[PDB]
């Protein structure tokens, strides 16, 4: 299976007074492992997973230097983009950035990403070949030109195919006990009468990791989407995830309906029957 390392950055201008609010978070797959918040006292990159605490002071000194530098880049960008879009100094605006790399089952580089948004819309993104850029509008063409002239893509690709992968490999090894452990969903079904004649069947998947999962109902062995309901996958708060799907059925006919669960942690999909 592949694994990913992603950093997410959000910068929000506060025109009234002072510099933007800057928040950076780092993830391996679905596990957050580092954070920086401009409003926090430490003014340091901080650990958020036990396995990153293995890294010594030089690591934190290094990441802190870079993340502070990232925050300045975003503060400058907010100024620049306000100018491109002819906006007032009065409003608050947002830049968002996400970059990172995947390795495959062979633990070699698989994919790299670098994308940038302004006010919640695409602005500029590195293409899958890591050699060129996609600009969403004419303002972004300016940035594209500048980055082409400065050969940003070449420097980015070197990081993504090199440093990025190498550290991802390190984190995976250091955090193997959790990062490389799949937690299959604990599944069960609840039953609620909604009348004398109808009941709700709810199929629950709990305590699973990673987040990706598929939960579906079948009736007499064919998929059923009508009269169903299904919540978005949500964090339990202990590092795992939760999901449920529900169906309304005539009382007494429950045996026709089966819940099917697919997850990386299951060698074979699960089929639950209301007994």
């Amino acid at each position: 299976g592949s694994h990913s390392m992603r950093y997410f950055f959000t910068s929000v201008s506060r025109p009234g007074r002072g510099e933007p609010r800057f928040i950076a978070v780092g993830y391996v797959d679905d596990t957050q492992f580092v954070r920086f918040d401009s409003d926090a006292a430490s003014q340091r990159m901080e650990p958020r997973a036990p396995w990153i605490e293995q890294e010594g002071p030089e690591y934190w000194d290094g990441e802190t230097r870079k993340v502070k530098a990232h925050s300045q880049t975003h503060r400058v960008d907010l100024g620049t983009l306000r100018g491109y879009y002819n906006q007032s100094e009065a409003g608050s605006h947002t830049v968002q950035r996400m970059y990172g790399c995947d390795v495959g089952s062979d633990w070699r580089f698989l994919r790299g990403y670098h994308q940038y948004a302004y006010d919640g819309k695409d602005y500029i993104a590195l293409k899958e070949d890591l050699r060129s850029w996609t600009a969403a509008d004419m303002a972004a063409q300016t940035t594209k030109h500048k980055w082409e002239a400065a050969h940003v893509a070449e420097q980015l690709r070197a990081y993504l195919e090199g440093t990025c992968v190498e550290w991802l490999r390190r984190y995976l090894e250091n955090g193997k006990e959790t990062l490389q452990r799949t937690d299959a969903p604990k599944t069960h079904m609840t039953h609620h009468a909604v009348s004398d004649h109808e009941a709700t069947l709810r199929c629950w998947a709990l305590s699973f990791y990673p987040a990706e999962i598929t939960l579906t109902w079948q009736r007499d062995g064919e998929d059923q989407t009508q009269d169903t309901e299904l919540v978005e996958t949500r964090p339990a708060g202990d590092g795992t995830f939760q999901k449920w799907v529900a169906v309304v059925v005539p009382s007494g006919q429950e045996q026709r309906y089966t819940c099917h669960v697919q997850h990386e942690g299951l060698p074979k999909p699960l089929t639950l029957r209301w007994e």
Binding site: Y7, G26, G62, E63, K66, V67, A69, H70, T73, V76, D77, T80, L81, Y99, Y116, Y123, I124, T143, K146, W147, A150, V152, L156, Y159, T163, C164, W167
Partner: peptide
């Protein structure tokens, strides 16, 4: 690990 430097837009 973070990238060492980001160019301005």
């Amino acid at each position: 690990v973070l990238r060492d430097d980001l160019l301005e837009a």
